[PDB]
């Protein structure tokens, strides 16, 4: 898979695999297996997890 876009300014834009929309500054969480980034609501995260908790996306959690 590929969820990073190199834009016309030379920057990287991350796309949430849950909704196929970019990071827009709202809270995101990064998968500690595959390194994709998801918007919190797209993965049911409703409050910040403990800092020491690893988070795994739906794809990786079943692997």
């Amino acid at each position: 898979s590929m969820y990073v876009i190199r834009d016309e300014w030379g920057n990287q834009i991350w796309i949430c695999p849950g909704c196929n929309k970019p990071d827009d500054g709202s809270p995101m969480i990064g998968c500690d297996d595959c390194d994709d980034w998801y918007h919190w609501p797209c993965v049911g995260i409703m409050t910040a997890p403990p800092e020491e908790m690893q988070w795994f996306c739906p794809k990786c959690a079943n692997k």
Binding site: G25, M28, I29, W55
Partner: peptide, 7 residues
């Protein structure tokens, strides 16, 4: 977990 946010 690793999180990010920007106003």
């Amino acid at each position: 977990a690793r999180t990010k946010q920007t106003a």
